[PDB]
Amino acid sequence: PLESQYQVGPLLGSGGFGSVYSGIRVSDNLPVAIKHVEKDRISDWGELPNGTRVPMEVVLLKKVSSGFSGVIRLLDWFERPDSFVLILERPEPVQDLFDFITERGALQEELARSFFWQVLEAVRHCHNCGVLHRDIKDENILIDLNRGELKLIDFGSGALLKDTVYTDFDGTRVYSPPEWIRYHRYHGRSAAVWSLGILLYDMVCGDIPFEHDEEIIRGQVFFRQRVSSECQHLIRWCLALRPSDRPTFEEIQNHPWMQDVLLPQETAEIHLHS
Numbered sequence: 001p002l003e004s005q006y007q008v009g010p011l012l013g014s015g016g017f018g019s020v021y022s023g024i025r026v027s028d029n030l031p032v033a034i035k036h037v038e039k040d041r042i043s044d045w046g047e048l049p050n051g052t053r054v055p056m057e058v059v060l061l062k063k064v065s066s067g068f069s070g071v072i073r074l075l076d077w078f079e080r081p082d083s084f085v086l087i088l089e090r091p092e093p094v095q096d097l098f099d100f101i102t103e104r105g106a107l108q109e110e111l112a113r114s115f116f117w118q119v120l121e122a123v124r125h126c127h128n129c130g131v132l133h134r135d136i137k138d139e140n141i142l143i144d145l146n147r148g149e150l151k152l153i154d155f156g157s158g159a160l161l162k163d164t165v166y167t168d169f170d171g172t173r174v175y176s177p178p179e180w181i182r183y184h185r186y187h188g189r190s191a192a193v194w195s196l197g198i199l200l201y202d203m204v205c206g207d208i209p210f211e212h213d214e215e216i217i218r219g220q221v222f223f224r225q226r227v228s229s230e231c232q233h234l235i236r237w238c239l240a241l242r243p244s245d246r247p248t249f250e251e252i253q254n255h256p257w258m259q260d261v262l263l264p265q266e267t268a269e270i271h272l273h274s
């Protein structure tokens, strides 16, 4: 049984993704997050190695499970008559990047560099494991405040990574690329790089650059805060209108703005513990 193994704590939040609760594993008192999703609300379904019908999210989290701590670990999962329940690792203390940015405003470039580098390492891990997240954004990034380590969450809009065109999308529209808005078509890696440009702008400006479809299509970036020329260049490159003009993960990590990154513990020491 599920509610014999886990002591349910308060509701953390709910939305399109389902309902997420704080929890504790009864046996060892390990902090967990308990995600409930109704079967009717799941459009994308996957197949487990031994042919079991499960939400894509379970397939994807299983593919990215390893010792690497840049992706939230799926500890267990359960099927109920009209729902699925996922048990996820829960760092303590933790804060999502959206709340962190709301609280602190625009981030110092040294902090934004450390955070962006860790999300690039996490997204490269997903891609290397054949997983495309499709909803990279501040709300889907968790900060392990004690360790200065960032974790990617919510693979509910994800898909298996492929080299052919995607014509389906259920991620966040203001992080979606102009090829999706205009043609309902995009390729995995270049669409991920566009969302990364949106995220980097969000970190250094304290808000997203585009709100309307017309602004995404135009792709003209206005800087509302003081941002270095090198950081502005990387953002504008990730936000290139033509998908083939966007940098690869290697070109982002070799960019001059990305050099001399702080270690996660140094990041926590300078920017989080203080």
Ligand SMILES: C[C@@H]1C[C@H](N)C[C@H](c2ccncc2NC(=O)c2ccc(F)c(-c3c(F)cccc3F)n2)C1
Binding pocket: 012, 013, 014, 017, 020, 022, 033, 035, 072, 088, 089, 090, 091, 094, 095, 096, 098, 139, 140, 142, 153, 154, 155, 156
């Ligand atoms: C209340 C959340 C708001 C987010 N901005 C989004 C979170 C989310 C959305 C969709 N699917 C799954 C998720 N959550 C998770 O997998 C998950 C896993 C481990 C965690 F430590 C947390 C968590 C959090 F994210 C914020 C505060 C406290 C937490 F425990 N969440 C729910």
